[PDB]
Write a protein that binds this ligand. Sequence first.
Ligand SMILES: Cn1cc(C(=O)Nc2cccc(C(=O)O)c2)ccc1=O
Length: 119
Amino acid sequence: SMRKKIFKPEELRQALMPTLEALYRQDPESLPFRQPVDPQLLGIPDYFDIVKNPMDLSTIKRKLDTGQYQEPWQYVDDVWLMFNNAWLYNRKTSRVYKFCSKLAEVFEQEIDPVMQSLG
Ligand SMILES: Cn1cc(C(=O)Nc2cccc(C(=O)O)c2)ccc1=O
């Protein structure tokens, strides 16, 4: 069958970290994504009922820093999970939803040349 895990996790860390840094540079749009959603703090007790697999920038960063991503698409999947969770949970008219859309646009712009560099 197909080859798997051809890149070292540390090669993926080096190649992909600039795309994550681009998200962190978005001010104010990254602020709601820097830390895990806290439903008690935010007064949204249904959050974990709706969002079964939460994700945020700090979790992605720690996974990439520590070499937990073994394939480039696993990193992409977690970034998309973060955005899809926020689009699912929040009203389309909301500030967090709009900020999510901004981060997603930045991510798409940054990820395509990096994925090409892994080709
Ligand atoms: C991803 N996400 C985030 C929030 C949120 O408001 N988080 C938060 C937590 C601390 C600070 C800040 C800040 O904007 O300063 C934001 C609410 C729903 C949601 O889906």
